[PDB]
Structure 1
């Protein structure tokens, strides 16, 4: 009940700005028709799990 009160402190005193970097664009000839209409032109290279 002291650690849960401490994780609430760190999220409050946050200060970060996201900067676009590393992004690349693939071609339509080089993607499955399933993985294509899910991508909006340019993905972020360092894609995460989902």
Structure 2
């Protein structure tokens, strides 16, 4: 229960504020079309996972 509390708390205090990070802007011809349909010009280098 206490777990949830400190989860909730840590959310109730996420005063983080995003600022644009390192961001590559790939030349369009170098990307496979399945990726090109997805990309909006530029992405963060830390793409993460989807």
* TM-score normalised to structure 1 length: 0.82
Q: CA RMSD in A?
A: 1.2
Q: Which runs of 4+ in 1 moved over 4 A?
A: none
Gapped regions of structure 1 (runs ≥ 5): none
Higher strand share: 2
Unaligned segments of structure 2, at least 5 residues: none
How many residues align? The count is: 50
With normalisation by structure 2, the TM-score equals 0.82
Query: Larger Rg: 1 or 2?
Result: 1
